[PDB]
Ligand binder design. Structure first.
Ligand SMILES: C[As](C)(=O)[O-]
Ligand SMILES: C[As](C)(=O)[O-]
Length: 313
């Protein structure tokens, strides 16, 4: 891989998000150790690990749940053992128990407290990357940027030097990064961020179906992925920043495979600003008909898209 960090999302800990706390192995799961070794064997050195704010911190501004933290630490041991980096993905869409950040119920400061606590736990660890928030939405780009700044600050106040992945609002889509249709763009709002630790990258997501939601197993053309990454890539370059494609996926068909090759090659050619990517998704709890799974079969076999991802790893 020409990019620094390449891998997959190991999805499962974020499942059944309405259930709080939920029960391990019934409502959600953490990944098997064997998942980490399988992907390591494919050349992948990075795992994005979704988990829920509500499960790791059952009361806002309160102590972390030690059982939940122990599960995260167990996954970290597996990643380290397999020479992988672990992205802690607070997989919450800028909400806590259904309420948006910025409301009276969930002040921006509550997210900063969460991250202060995780940073204190993981600061002495080079394998750990902090994924501040999965797909913020329902919040303006300036407001989200204020929340993100508060969180970066809280992390750095602990002495933590770990890489922080910072998303925008609008589900952090690469394609819409520069859009001013509805007001201030992610591009404009996030220009003012400061990281006194100088170890930040911007996380974008990109799907290739008609509304870029990953709702359908269709790629609208054989070049749409690379096309949708261009604006964001230029913004990174303009601002001397790095980027990370925290989620992307393509279905198993010829037009999608071409689009996937094109977007992976595009990020390789633009590796001055692309730090890496993590495919959505693997993990043991996807049904076999889920169009984007790269979880190996019960029979040990590789999924179709893995043959392409492995080439770029
Ligand atoms: C896999 As998603 C687009 O809900 O972060
Ligand atoms: C969470 As999805 C819309 O990429 O299956």
């Amino acid at each position: 891989h020409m990019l620094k960090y390449v891998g997959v999302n190991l999805s499962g800990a974020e499942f059944n998000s309405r259930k709080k706390p939920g029960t391990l192995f019934k409502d959600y799961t953490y990944p098997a150790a064997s998942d980490f070794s399988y992907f390591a064997g494919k050349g992948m050195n990075t795992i994005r690990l979704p988990f829920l704010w509500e499960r790791v911190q059952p009361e806002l501004n309160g102590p972390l749940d030690q059982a939940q933290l122990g599960l995260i630490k167990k996954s970290l041991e597996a990643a380290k053992a397999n020479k992988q980096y672990l992205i802690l993905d607070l997989h919450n869409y800028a909400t806590y128990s259904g309420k948006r950040i910025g409301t009276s119920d969930v002040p921006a400061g509550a997210l900063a407290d969460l991250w202060r606590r995780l940073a204190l736990e993981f600061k002495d660890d080079k394998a750990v990357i902090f994924g501040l928030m999965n797909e913020p939405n329902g919040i303006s780009a300036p407001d989200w940027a204020n929340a993100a700044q508060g969180t970066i600050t809280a992390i750095r106040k602990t002495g933590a030097k770990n890489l922080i992945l910072v998303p925008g609002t609008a589900y952090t889509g690469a394609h819409s990064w520069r859009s001013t249709s509805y007001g201030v763009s992610n591009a404009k709002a996030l220009e003012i961020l400061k990281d006194p630790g100088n170890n930040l990258a911007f996380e974008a997501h990109q799907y290739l179906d008609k509304d870029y939601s990953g709702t359908k197993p269709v790629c609208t053309s054989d070049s749409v992925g690379q096309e949708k990454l261009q604006g964001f890539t230029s913004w990174l370059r303009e601002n001397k920043q790095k980027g990370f494609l925290g989620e992307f996926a393509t279905a198993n068909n010829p037009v999608c495979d071409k689009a996937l090759e094109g977007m992976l090659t595009y990020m390789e050619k633009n590796s001055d600003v692309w730090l890496g990517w993590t495919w959505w998704a693997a993990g043991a709890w996807w049904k076999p008909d889920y169009p984007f799974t790269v979880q190996p079969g019960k029979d040990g076999s590789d999924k179709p898209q893995m043959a392409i991802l492995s080439k770029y790893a």
